[PDB]
Amino acid sequence: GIHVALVTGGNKGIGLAIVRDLCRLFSGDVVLTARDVTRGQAAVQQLQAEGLSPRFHQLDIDDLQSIRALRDFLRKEYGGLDVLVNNAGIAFKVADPTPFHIQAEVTMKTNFFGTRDVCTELLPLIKPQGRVVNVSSIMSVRALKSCSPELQQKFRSETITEEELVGLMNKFVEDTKKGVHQKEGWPSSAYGVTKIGVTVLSRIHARKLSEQRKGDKILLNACCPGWVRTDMAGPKATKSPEEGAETPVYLALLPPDAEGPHGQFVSEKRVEQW
């Protein structure tokens, strides 16, 4: 009955710092995952040289077969999962020349659909007193404010369903392909919209857990890790990966029986208004 925590996108950046902290603070096994097996194994070796003992499993959140193989591994080895940190994500660099509609499709595929597929496959494995942490971004809040009032209403809704949200996320991508995203009320940041998806998906999944698994004391939240020096944000950012890991780790390790936060967007360990 060994407890297990898992971090997606764990080979570098904020993900690696989360894995490192969980190795020290989580009472059980910690699984570092990475899409590239050599990069993941190198990260495990780095942490071993620091005196830590993470496990490794491959995971690419854009490959459903990869997610399913991880699901099967967790069921066989642990009988489920205690802590899930959905950290993996991508962004196009500012003024990357890639056509915007391609930036939209690609960023959405990973940040939203990939994250959603991991939740689809692994949420059923979450044990009582488990915790799920979805790494979103303050860019979701910024993007939300740049949406039309109609879209703001839909994304802030307490009654929105997962299928409605998926419809809206695909609508953004389709609108960019048709040359109509501005006209249809969307913001200019594709990354921002994908993080709207992550934030709102967390709200919905928290509602579903309270509906379907009441009594199991599972807490699920979205978070902003802050502005962190990584390959995504670059060297000018204000936080180290260590500092970036604090809020996700806080949310992952919420004491047993805690009533909240649940279904919240959390920054600097504090609940933000959506």
Ligand X SMILES: NC(=O)c1ccc[n+]([C@@H]2O[C@H](COP(=O)([O-])OP(=O)(O)OC[C@H]3O[C@@H](n4cnc5c(N)ncnc54)[C@H](OP(=O)(O)O)[C@@H]3O)[C@@H](O)[C@H]2O)c1
Ligand Y SMILES: N[C@@H](CCC(=O)N[C@@H](CSCO)C(=O)NCC(=O)O)C(=O)O
Ligand Z SMILES: CC(C)(C)n1nc(-c2cccc(O)c2)c2c(N)ncnc21
* Residue 11 touching ligand X (CB under 6 A): yes
Scanning 19-27, 113-121, 180-188, 255-263 for contacts with ligand Z by CB under 6 A, the matching segment is 19-27
C-alpha 219/C-alpha 116 separation (Å) is 17
* Residue 90 touching ligand Z (CB under 6 A): no
Return all residues near 269 (Cβ < 8 A) that are at least 6 apart: 246, 247, 250
Strands across the sheet containing 4-7: 55-58, 29-34, 4-7, 81-86, 126-135, 219-224, 265-267, 270-272
103, 107, 137, 247: which one binds ligand X (CB under 6 A): 137
C-alpha 105/C-alpha 119 separation (Å) is 20
* Residue 224 touching ligand Y (CB under 6 A): no
* Residue 31 touching ligand Z (CB under 6 A): no
C-alpha 55/C-alpha 33 separation (Å) is 8
C-alpha 68/C-alpha 77 separation (Å) is 14
* Residue 228 touching ligand X (CB under 6 A): yes
Between strands 270-272 and 265-267, the pairing is antiparallel
9, 14, 19, 21: which one binds ligand Z (CB under 6 A): 21
The answer to whether 193 is annotated as binding is yes
Residue 35, binding choice from ligand X, ligand Z, ligand Y, none, Cβ under 5 to 8 Å by partner class: ligand X
The answer to whether 13 is annotated as binding is yes
190, 196, 204, 209: which one binds ligand Y (CB under 6 A): 190
Written as one string, the DSSP assignment of 246-266 is HHHHHHHTPPTT-----S-EE
Return all residues near 80 (Cβ < 8 A) that are at least 6 apart: 4, 74, 125, 126, 127, 130
The backbone torsions φ and ψ at residue 20, rounded to the nearest 5 degrees and listed phi first, read: -60, -45
Number of H helices, E strands in the chain: 11, 8
The answer to whether 27 is annotated as binding is yes
The answer to whether 92 is annotated as binding is yes
189, 202, 221, 230: which one binds ligand Y (CB under 6 A): 189
Residue 20, binding choice from ligand Y, ligand X, ligand Z, none, Cβ under 5 to 8 Å by partner class: ligand Z
The answer to whether 109 is annotated as binding is no
Residue 13, binding choice from ligand Y, ligand X, ligand Z, none, Cβ under 5 to 8 Å by partner class: ligand X
C-alpha 146/C-alpha 128 separation (Å) is 38
Residues near ligand Y (CB under 6 A): 91-94, 103, 107, 139, 189-191, 232-234
Residues near ligand Z (CB under 6 A): 20-21, 24-25, 91, 137-139, 227, 232-233, 242
Residues near ligand X (CB under 6 A): 8-9, 11-15, 34-36, 39, 59-62, 87-90, 110, 114, 135, 137, 224-225, 227-228, 230-233, 237
Which residues belong to the annotated binding site?
7-31, 60-61, 87, 92-94, 103, 137, 190-195, 228-230
